[PDB]
RNA sequence: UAGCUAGUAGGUGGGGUAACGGCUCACCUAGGCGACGAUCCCUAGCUGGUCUGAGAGGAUGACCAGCCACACUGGAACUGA
RNA sequence: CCCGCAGAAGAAGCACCGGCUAACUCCGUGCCAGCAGCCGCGGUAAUACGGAGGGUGCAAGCGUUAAUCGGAAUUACUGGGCGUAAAGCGCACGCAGGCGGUUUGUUAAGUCAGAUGUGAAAUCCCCGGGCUCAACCUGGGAACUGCAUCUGAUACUGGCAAG
């Protein structure tokens, strides 16, 4: 029984990267979609795209640089069988800074960063580098 | 081993038996020996190991190494005793101090005195 | 009753004050309700060894507590010092 | 403004009084999963108008039992 | 407490100069500076990266003679200031009153300067002061009680002195006997064969 | 101007028809001081074959790491043969704290500032086994952002 | 039974007597560890370093005419507060104390109880246990020991 | 150590208390507690802190400060804020 | 506390030197013994027992024992495992319990943000000050990670409703 979509979605990726494929796809969420915008944009992929209406699926174009896959170590912290948040000014760091920690805060998802800029506190997704 | 796991049943940890019962956190204890003998090792080592059967203010009885050189120990006889274990005994995890409390001051010893007692000789 | 007095600090032939609001029932170095300033008797011009918070202690007395003589002392120094 | 919980009665065997449980969810001290606790409670129902589940809201009061320290005021769904 | 044995074995045992004598003859004209000491002082023993961190250690103690636990004291404070830490452990070494002396060359050796400091013979900032191991600030002015100012043993040292490089931080006039010391010094103002980085291994064992 | 620093020796065995035959391995680690490194490994018969040989091999595969100013860009471990090590770069003249077999791999490479400690077995050939491969996997500021198509700010 | 004690106990003594001291008591266990146990008795007194002297010259009586061929070990001792008694000597020299005993027999109303010797006669031994002066046949003993209680 | 409890759980009334209250009593109701560990058993004064630890934790509660408890043992009260 | 006086004059020891672990030989020594935290040690030579010289460490102390944490990721929340090393129930069903696809609304419980109260003093920490230094004492601060309350935030998890 999956019952994860998020970690499903993670592994997908990480065991996509591996096998070297060109593009991962999941069965979409509206969250999914928050979570690849964030770090689309933050070069960790190309782009996404979701398409269908009654099991829309979301689409994802991977990344390598050199030979080596751009994302390369993926890992759901907050998980289904043992929650997490953290206050504004214990927001993890990945990699001193140089991973990203995506975090879902009343004002949406983002990274760890534009969270410590808008000072908020959430719940820690993912860590990915 | 899982959280939820834990939650129903945390973590335990099984206590430290003291190797040194007879002590019950006391450095040194005062002991009268009920008995004095003395035990050589199989055929291939020989060796002599003085140790003596104690009576402890406790109420315990237990062996404790003689730590030689001095032997003027015999029934009823107070003496010392610290918990340490020599290798190649089976039960001795005592050592009886030498230089106190009905212990002979061994003879002369100009090295490392103080751990038998022996005080220095004014020459 | 609550009285304004000195408990005893510092060390052995070096005592230091720190002046006190507390029920007179209890030893002079239990417990308290506001400390509000300190007495140095060996200051000699070093440091300043008599501060008082006397609005916050007018506030007190000002509700019927009363003063150890020896602050009461002090507290007429202050004032000289103005 | 006046304090108060949120509880939900398990039991009204007892003359103008009732069971409350109260639900609060905490996370735990050191494996970090967060859980849910009750808090059984004993809130005297005045005029004894409260079925069983029918989620009700108290009140703290002075002592009115050896065990009771509890006031009802209101009920916020009639147990279906 | 007080190393009060000779003290040329311990320079032939660190293998090195520790200025322990007033210097008006070289070293090797007074020992062998190149050999270890004692029976087998000869033969050059195969030592550990721990043996290389104990012999730093018991250098600069010995070319500064601060006994053990007040040494690590040192430490444990230098530790818990800012900066690099080994650095400023050398430099509230190069703060003890006495060295500060013997730096401003009142004192040949450090010994020398040890005893006057010890029989009250130095004022800081006009007060007299005792203890060795005083620490010193910047802008202190030490000096010459006069019950001293006429002792011969600090004018020979004085005329010592300026046969060594002056020191840069603190600032002395020998004219009345009594020096400033300006600044903390800094770490290139020290030597170079002091490794620090090893005397924190040390401890941080 | 390289750095060299032998780490271990052992006496192996090797029973033959009479009796056995033993040898000495040795087992040394070879840097440049700044960021570039390499070990080797080699069997002989006696010590100074070994540790003469094996310090050869370390000439080549001297990998080059991207580390900073005596120190490391971001916490890393390595896990290799049931060994595991943990670093983390650590703050200006902190020192290289290390178990005994890191320690010269991490000075050789040209680390001043570093904290680490060993987990599992020790021994000392799968710690470096470990460690190297844990030192590689550091990235730069840049590497990040080139692989991240980004500005280092921009990371940063 | 008795692993050729008879040559044990002659071994032992030659040498022992030949010190001025008395043996008492010959005790070897085997499979445990096979460490013999012997007791002797010197009026003056013994120290640990005159056990030494014996087990160094009953070890060497023991070596050459060793044919058990069990591991070589042997302690020896003297006497502890708790001693055992073997002969009916060693009862007689035992007047009044507390003597513990077994029977041999594991069946139900066997002996093992301990009395304070009475009267002492060679097959027959008389202690005082519940009140009563028993007669008990030393040969049927399993083991027994004295006046484990120190005052 | 799995069930525990009849003044037990609740109500009415009276008494009682400086004060609320099974505090007590009458009366009525038949409950109340427990696997979110009741009950039982062993151990222990509690805390601020203290030692250790990189940390999280582990240990501990000597000194000093807060609180409690006790004053040969057991019981009872009197006086009195 | 100061001044004067006399005179180097009144004041250094304890462990250890096979490895771990800084520091080595001589002579006995005979596996006699003794040494021992472990591994180990001893023969005709033993850098490991005893003495000697020399050396290392520490110092008005130095060692031994005890006790606690650490090292120990060796109860692994941080931070372990379970094919054969210890460890998957013989299998299944199933209550309690844990966990839960996807969309919208609602709620604001969790959560987050903010405020407010409180979290004794001492202690610890930072910046000072004072005893000639230091220990010590002291100013001020930081901190006390907590709790409660109020006002927000709605992505997330929960609740409710509708799919
Ligand atoms: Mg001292
Ligand atoms: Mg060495
Ligand atoms: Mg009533
Ligand atoms: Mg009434
Ligand atoms: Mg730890
Ligand atoms: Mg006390
Ligand atoms: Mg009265
Ligand atoms: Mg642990
Ligand atoms: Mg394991
Ligand atoms: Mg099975
Ligand atoms: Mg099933
Ligand atoms: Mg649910
Ligand atoms: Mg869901
Ligand atoms: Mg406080
Ligand atoms: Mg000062
Ligand atoms: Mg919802």
Redesign the pocket.
Known sequence: ??????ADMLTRIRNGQAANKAAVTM????????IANVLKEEGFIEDFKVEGDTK?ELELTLKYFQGKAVVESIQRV?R????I??????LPKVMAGLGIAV???????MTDRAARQA?????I?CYVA | ??????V?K?????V?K????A??????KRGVCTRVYTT?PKKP??????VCRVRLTNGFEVTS?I???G?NLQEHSVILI????????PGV?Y?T?RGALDCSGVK?????????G???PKA | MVTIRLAR???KK?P?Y?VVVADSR??R????IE?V??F?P???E??EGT?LDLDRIAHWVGQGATISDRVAALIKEVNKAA | ?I?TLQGRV????????I?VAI?????H??????????????V?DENNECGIGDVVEIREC???????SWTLVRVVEKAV | ?????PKL??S??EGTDLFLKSGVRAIDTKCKIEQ??????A?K????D??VQ??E??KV?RIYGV?????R?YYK?AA???GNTGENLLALLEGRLDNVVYRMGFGATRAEAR?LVS??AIM?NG?????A???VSPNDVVSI?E?AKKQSRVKAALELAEQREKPTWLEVDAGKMEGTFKRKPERSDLSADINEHLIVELYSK | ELQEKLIAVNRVSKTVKGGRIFSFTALTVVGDGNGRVGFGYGKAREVPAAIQKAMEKARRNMINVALNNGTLQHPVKGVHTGS?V?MQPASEGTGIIAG?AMRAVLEVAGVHNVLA????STNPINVVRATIDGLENMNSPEMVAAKRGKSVEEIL | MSTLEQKLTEMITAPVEALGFELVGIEFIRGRTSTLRIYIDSEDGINV?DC?DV??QVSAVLDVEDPITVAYNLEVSSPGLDRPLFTAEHYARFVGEEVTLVLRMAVQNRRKWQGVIKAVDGEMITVTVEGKDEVFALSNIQKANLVPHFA
Not at chain 5, 1 to 5: I, K, N, T
Not at chain 5, 45 to 48: A, D, E, M, Y
Not at chain 5, 127 to 131: D, G, H, L, M, Y
């Open positions: 029984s999956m019952q994860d979509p998020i069965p979409s969420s509206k969250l999914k979609v928050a829309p907050s289904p069988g043992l929650r948040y953290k206050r504004k000014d214990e975090v879902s805060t009343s004002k949406g998802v000072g908020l506190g959430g719940e997704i | 081993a899982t959280v939820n796991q834990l129903r945390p973590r335990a940890r099984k430290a003291s190797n040194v019962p002590l019950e956190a006391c450095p040194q050589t080592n020989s060796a002599l190991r003085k190494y730590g030689g050189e032997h610290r918990g340490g274990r020599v290798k190649d005994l995890r050592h101090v002369d010893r100009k090295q490392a005195r103080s751990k038998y022996v005080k220095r | 600090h510092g060390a070096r230091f720190q209890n030893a170095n239990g417990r308290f400390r300033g300190f140095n060996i200051a000699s070093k440091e501060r | 403004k304090r398990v039991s009204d065997k007892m003359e103008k009084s069971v639900e609060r969810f905490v996370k001290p050191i494996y970090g999963k967060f859980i849910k606790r009750t808090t059984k409670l004993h005297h002075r002592p009115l039992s050896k065990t009771k | 407490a007080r190393y009060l044995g074995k311990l032939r045992r270890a000491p004692g029976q087998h002082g033969r023993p195969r030592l550990s721990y043996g104990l012999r250690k018991q103690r006994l053990e636990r007040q040494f004291n404070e818990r200031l800012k005893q029989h009250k800081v007060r007299v002061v005792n203890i191991s005083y620490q009680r019950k | 595991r943990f005994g400690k060993a987990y599992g | 370093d030494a087990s160094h």
